[PDB]
């Protein structure tokens, strides 16, 4: 009678088995291995350029594949493509609805995506055969609000929505192909691994799931944080990644050991993290706190390497170019700041 | 060889900058409002009347040469902690709540909890709230016939009397005004509990009549901007 209780007890037994297995392969630690090496030192960074083209707060500020141009969107209804070398606005696009929460710059410099509280994803064009930009393809198959989008190739892009269901689209026709479900809370962000075969997704259910694009199933699931997962980024190597939550704690996870590596939390900060990403070599980890600062830590020594002041309001987006030559930040004060 | 690349970029920058300035003029010339509520309080009926005319349902109108864009979220999920942060620059939040649905399942307590969570927010702390009291005719119909009693769901209601500075409509029994003003000053108390010196609240009694209401929100945005301008100059 009531076999669902038996199912639940065997599920928690499997959970205990997983915990014991993870404890079995944790004889050593990481802080004892990173010793005997030289620290990074007190690095001092100076803001290089500032961009003044937005009216409302910037939200996504997606970088470019050519390491020279970038894209940005705000809550005013405008999508601005900037040139970082000459400090010039390459393009300005008016959107259908004012509210936007993410962009996705295509790796071919031809398309660019948007998305917000309108439950639709627009894909524009850049190789203008008539000069002006126009909506090239719309995607409407979700009920919840869009959170993040990352292009994969020239004709498909994976997005995450607020209805605990993410999907892969086929803009060549206009229909979705694969659907990933399993999260209880709305998925907040996603990050594509450099292998172009699998991607990590972070949600509000204090979890992070590793999905396979061609299979559609969930490979691994990590639960180490205690609050919402605001941002998630992938290590450039392909065997680890980092996550920044809403509890003043960022954590480094790996895929092979199936457990967390080290937490970069500190005592004197209580605010939350909104965006986090890695560097070219992965030695430094930049995270955007909610106390109007940006903290860069040593990814190995678990110590603060630098603090970046600036924006009076909260910083909402952080990005690093592919070549690792400069960094870009976007906050709620209508200011885009490129640092070197 | 960089002659052609520079001049075209410069003229494009100038043109798009002039265009974005001309459009920013219009963006600054208008206002934005966010309408929400506890649910099943008559949002369709009031949007048929207030607006007088797919997660983000928007309605644009204009009065006395100032424009307002009212945004509804009646096509979203139940959780409201992640997406509600996008409405930081909105000048007013129209919180329409039913005042007769207390029995049919403590919806008044739900609305009070929602108001308390909104008021003490980290980013919504600088946003005033416009409050409506829907279905006052249903209050009058339910207190006169004897459908339910507020005392069962509110013990301190027995130690409350109608204030003297009230505006009782002629031909109205004192119990209707008692219950309505009890709801009103409970909302006002839960609002003024924290306080910031930055935003305030404004109660209103409407939606019981199907008459005009655009004047109320207009005057509310007006004196809200007046109060924020007074606070900016420290003369408040």
């Amino acid at each position: 009678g009531s076999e669902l209780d038996q199912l639940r007890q065997e599920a928690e037994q499997l959970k205990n088995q997983i915990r014991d297995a993870r404890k079995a392969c944790a004889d050593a630690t990481l802080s004892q291995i990173t010793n005997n090496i030289d620290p990074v030192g007190r690095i001092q960074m100076r803001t290089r350029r500032t961009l003044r083209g937005h009216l409302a707060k910037i939200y996504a500020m997606h970088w470019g594949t050519d390491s020279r141009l970038l894209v940005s969107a705000s809550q005013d209804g405008k999508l601005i493509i900037w040139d970082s070398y000459t400090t010039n606005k390459v393009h300005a696009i008016p959107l259908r609805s004012s509210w936007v929460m993410t962009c996705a710059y295509a790796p071919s410099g031809n398309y660019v995506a948007c998305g917000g509280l309108d439950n639709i994803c627009s894909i524009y064009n850049l190789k203008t055969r008539e000069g002006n930009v126009r909506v090239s393809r719309e995607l409407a198959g979700h009920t919840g609000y869009l959170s993040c989008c990352r292009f994969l190739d020239d004709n498909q892009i994976v997005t995450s929505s607020g209805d605990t269901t993410c999907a892969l689209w086929d803009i060549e026709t206009g229909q979705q192909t694969t659907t990933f479900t399993g999260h209880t809370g709305d998925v907040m962000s996603l990050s594509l691994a450099p292998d172009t075969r699998l991607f990590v997704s972070g949600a509000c259910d204090a979890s992070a799931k590793l999905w396979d694009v061609r299979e559609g199933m969930c490979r691994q699931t990590f639960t180490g944080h205690e609050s919402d997962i605001n941002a998630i980024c992938f290590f450039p190597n392909g065997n680890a990644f980092a996550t920044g939550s809403d509890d003043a704690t960022c954590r480094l996870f790996d895929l092979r050991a199936d457990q967390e590596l080290m937490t970069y939390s500190h005592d004197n900060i209580i605010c939350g993290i909104t965006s986090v990403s890695f560097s070219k070599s992965g030695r430094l980890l930049l995270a955007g706190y909610d106390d109007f600062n940006c903290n860069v830590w040593d990814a190995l020594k678990a110590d603060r390497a630098g603090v970046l002041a600036g924006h009076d309001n909260r910083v909402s987006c952080l990005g690093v170019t592919d070549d690792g030559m400069a960094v870009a930040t976007g906050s709620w004060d209508s200011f885009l700041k490129i640092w070197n | 060889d960089q002659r052609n690349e520079e001049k075209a970029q410069r003229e494009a920058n100038k043109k798009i900058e002039k265009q974005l300035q001309k459009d920013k003029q219009v963006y600054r010339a208008t206002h934005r409002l966010l309408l929400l509520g506890a649910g099943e309080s008559g949002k369709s009926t009031i949007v048929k009347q207030m607006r007088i005319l797919t997660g983000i349902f928007e309605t644009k109108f204009q009065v006395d040469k100032v424009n307002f864009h009212m945004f509804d979220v009646g096509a979203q999920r139940d959780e409201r902690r992640k997406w509600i942060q996008c409405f930081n620059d909105v000048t007013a939040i129209i919180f329409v709540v039913a005042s007769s649905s207390y029995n049919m399942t403590n919806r008044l307590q739900e609305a009070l909890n929602l108001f308390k969570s909104i008021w003490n927010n980290r980013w919504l702390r600088t946003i005033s709230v416009i409050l409506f009291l829907n279905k006052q005719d249903l209050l009058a119909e339910k207190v006169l016939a004897g459908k339910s009693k507020i005392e069962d769901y509110f013990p301190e209601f027995a130690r409350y009397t109608t204030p003297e500075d009230a505006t009782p409509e002629p031909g109205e029994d004192p119990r209707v005004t008692r219950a309505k003003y009890f709801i009103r000053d409970e909302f006002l108390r839960i609002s003024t509990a924290s306080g910031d010196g930055r935003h305030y609240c404004y109660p209103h009694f409407t939606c019981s009549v199907d008459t005009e209401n655009i004047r109320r929100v207009f005057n509310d945005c007006r004196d809200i901007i007046q109060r924020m301008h007074l606070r900016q100059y420290e003369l408040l």
Partner: nanobody
Amino acid sequence: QVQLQESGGGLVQPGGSLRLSCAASGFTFSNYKMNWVRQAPGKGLEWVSDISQSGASISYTGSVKGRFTISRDNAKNTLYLQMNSLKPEDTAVYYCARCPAPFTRDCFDVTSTTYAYRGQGTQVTVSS
């Protein structure tokens, strides 16, 4: 890994005293704002009570004012709820919830059956 458990429950006649103890694991109990929320068979979720970060602020709904009492404890990381003179309408299932963000007072866990910090619950039902 967040985890919540609760001890309590029974079929007692109207006019008794019941004690429920909610225990948490996987996070710092000395920083968040715990709360109790219940729902009756046939109705939606109903916010019951909350406890602040320290224990100075106490708020009860109208239906339970002055009858049921709560108190947290950071030593055992557990919060205790006490039903005194149980009314015949408290035949509901209870859940011990937790606000999503620390240091902030914004708390709403009455969402429809989807939450990451709501425990298993306990079906408290009075007798006849």
